[PDB]
Every structure is written in structure tokens, then in C-alpha cells.
């Protein structure tokens, strides 16, 4: 109920993957079964530190704010 593991394996479309293993299911975002559980996290990818706010430009794969935009001293 509280968040509990069973089995390592994981089941991704009915395929038996490893744990450790590292699958990509969108070019946008990840999935890895992490602790046997299918962690899916946003694809960050490189950019400022402040910054100020995330956001996708248009459509990509990176859902953050670029370093090249608006840039500070």
C-alpha cells in the first residue's frame, strides 16, 4: 500500500527487463527500472544554473530553460 517492492524484473509492454537496465520509451523522456521499479524522469538536458523558470521552447526534449536565452551577466 505504502509504496511497496516486489520482484525485481519489470514488466514494460510485457517485456522482462533488467534493473539495472536503462530503457528508452521517448526520445523526450526516460525510463529505467530503478530498484526494480520503473522510474520515468523528464529529460534534462544541459543548460544555466539561476536561470529563472523551466520551460520547453515549442516542442523538444528538454522541458527547462536553455543557457544562451536571456542570460544574465
Given at each position: ?15 522482462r527487463y533488467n534493473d539495472k537496465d536503462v530503457w ?15 522510474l520515468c524522469d523528464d529529460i534534462i538536458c544541459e ?27
Amino acid at each position: 500500500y505504502v509504496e511497496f517492492q516486489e520482484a525485481g524484473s519489470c514488466v514494460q509492454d510485457g517485456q522482462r527487463y533488467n534493473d539495472k537496465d536503462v530503457w528508452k520509451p521517448e526520445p523526450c523522456r526516460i525510463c529505467v527500472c530503478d530498484t526494480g521499479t520503473v522510474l520515468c524522469d523528464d529529460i534534462i538536458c544541459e543548460d544555466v544554473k539561476d536561470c529563472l523558470s523551466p520551460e520547453i521552447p515549442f516542442g523538444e526534449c528538454c522541458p527547462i530553460c536553455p543557457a544562451d536565452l536571456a542570460a544574465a551577466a
